[PDB]
Each structure stands twice: as structure tokens, then as C-alpha cells.
Design a protein around this nucleic acid. Structure first.
Ligand code: MG
Ligand code: MG
Ligand code: MG
Ligand code: MG
Ligand code: MG
Ligand code: MG
Ligand code: MG
Ligand code: MG
Length: 44
RNA sequence: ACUGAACUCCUCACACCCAAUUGGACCAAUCUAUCACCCUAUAGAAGAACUAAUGUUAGUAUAAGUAACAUGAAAACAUUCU
């Protein structure tokens, strides 16, 4: 099982590494900007 | 016969010019948790960034040193005159 030793190939897994899993939460878009929102949920 | 453009070719480098709406990836600053020690990495947040709403608080221009405004005269400030 190469997993544990492959992990041993790095420094100590400190608190600086606990990443949310990619696909954890979709981006919290503030309803604005040049791309997502110009009228923010109501239209003209 | 030329001159005449993002049409096209010419050499690089090409996924870099609609309307809403939707869908994905990055980040301005701050706080926190570990890092780090001239502005820093990665994560959880969240009152999270403005050329404007006939917005409001402070400052300050302009119109401008303009529009408008006051002390009867004289005299040693005794007093006289109008
Ligand atoms: Mg072309
Ligand atoms: Mg288009
Ligand atoms: Mg940045
Ligand atoms: Mg905000
Ligand atoms: Mg402003
Ligand atoms: Mg204003
Ligand atoms: Mg004038
Ligand atoms: Mg005058």
C-alpha cells in the first residue's frame, strides 16, 4: 500500500493543509459584478 | 492606373470585442485557525470593494473679495453749531 509511504514523502501534515475537498461548496457568488449580476435577482 | 479598412495574406502569438439569464474558475481588503515576520501561504467566515439613488455628516470652491451693511461737522474731546 503505497499510500502511507507516499504521504510520508512530505513534511508533517500540519493544520496548514486540511483542504476542503474540491467540490465541497459551489462558489458563494455575491449577486453582482460584470458577469453574474447586474440587476440581482429581479431583472429590469 | 493608383489610394483606399480589424475582409485576407504576410512573421509571431492567437481559448483575450453582443442583450438578458444561467453555468464554471479566480481574487481587493479584514477577522479567525495554523504559517510567516516590510505584507506572507492555505483554509472557515462575513456589515466583505461605488463616477451617481433629487441620499446624509464634515471640509472646501464658485457666483466674488461682487449683492448687501454701518460713525452729523468741528475742535484742548472742555464744548459750539446744524
Ligand atoms: Mg481577420
Ligand atoms: Mg458574443
Ligand atoms: Mg490579490
Ligand atoms: Mg460589503
Ligand atoms: Mg464617493
Ligand atoms: Mg451624492
Ligand atoms: Mg458679477
Ligand atoms: Mg452697492
Amino acid at each position: 500500500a503505497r499510500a502511507l509511504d507516499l504521504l510520508r514523502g512530505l513534511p508533517r501534515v500540519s493544520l496548514a493543509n486540511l483542504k476542503p475537498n474540491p467540490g465541497s461548496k459551489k462558489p458563494e457568488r455575491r449577486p453582482r459584478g460584470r458577469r453574474r449580476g447586474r440587476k440581482c435577482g429581479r431583472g429590469h
